[PDB]
Chains A and B, each alone.
Chain A
Amino acid sequence: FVNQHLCGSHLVEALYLVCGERGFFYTPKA
């Protein structure tokens, strides 16, 4: 599911699923 253009909440949800308990950071301007 990761190998596509992912924008907005779509990208956030991919990060959430992949990173799992490591958690993540979403910085859409940096």
Chain B
Amino acid sequence: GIVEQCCTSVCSLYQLENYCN
């Protein structure tokens, strides 16, 4: 989930926006 994608690897706007409502 978001921690794997943005904390343990480099985040991106695309991935953040996957978690917007």
Contacts and interface: CB of A to CB of B under 8 A. Distances in A.
A27 B2 contact: yes
Interface string B1-21: 111001111111100110111
Would you call the interface of chain A mostly helix, strand, loop, or mixed?
loop
Given A5-B6, A11-B2, A11-B6, A26 B19 contact: yes
Contact of B16 (A5, A14, A27): A14
A27 B10 CA distance: 17
Interface residues of A, number: 21
B1 to A, nearest CB: 5
Interface of A: 2-8, 11, 14-15, 18-19, 22-30
